């Protein structure tokens, strides 16, 4: 539901686990920012 907020990108690590990266703050996190 809804686009990611600007700056954010969804990726998958080398084991297949989905995470989210915020290119403004250079933080990566497991949690979908749209859930927050």
């Amino acid at each position: 539901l809804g686009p990611l907020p600007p700056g954010w990108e969804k990726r998958t690590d080398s084991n297949g686990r989905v995470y989210f990266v915020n290119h403004n703050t250079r933080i990566t996190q497991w949690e979908d920012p749209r859930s927050q």
């Binding site: 990726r11 690590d13 686990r17 995470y19 989210f20 990266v21 250079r26 933080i27 990566t28 996190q29 497991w30």
Partner: peptide, 10 residues
């Protein structure tokens, strides 16, 4: 665990 460091990501 935590996700990769950004500087590993990019």
């Amino acid at each position: 665990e935590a996700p990769p460091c950004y500087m590993d990501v990019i």
